[PDB]
Amino acid sequence: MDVKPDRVIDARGSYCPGPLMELIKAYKQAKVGEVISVYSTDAGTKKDAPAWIQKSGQELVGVFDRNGYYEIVMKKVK
Numbered sequence: 001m002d003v004k005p006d007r008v009i010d011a012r013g014s015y016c017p018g019p020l021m022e023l024i025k026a027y028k029q030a031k032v033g034e035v036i037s038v039y040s041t042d043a044g045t046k047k048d049a050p051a052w053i054q055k056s057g058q059e060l061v062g063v064f065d066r067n068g069y070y071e072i073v074m075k076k077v078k
Helices: 020-027 045-056
Strands: 058-060 073-076
Touching (some): 020 058, 045 073
16 A cells, blocks of 8 residues: 555554454545554454454555554555
8 A cells, every 4th residue: 555654543452453444444534545553462453453454445455463552554645
């Protein structure tokens, strides 16, 4: 995605992680052609995170790391 998106998206232990929705709820925060960066720790959003944007309507970004807190990015494309 825009990985260069500027937004507030972080989920700690939200599975999908729990933040899996942080994206879907992000698309509403951002706008098409935009990007948003999310994070988590549950290590679930890493898999779902890339699913939130799928519905959110933002570009599919790439950002996954399980060192303390995961996160995902999405380029608003609604």
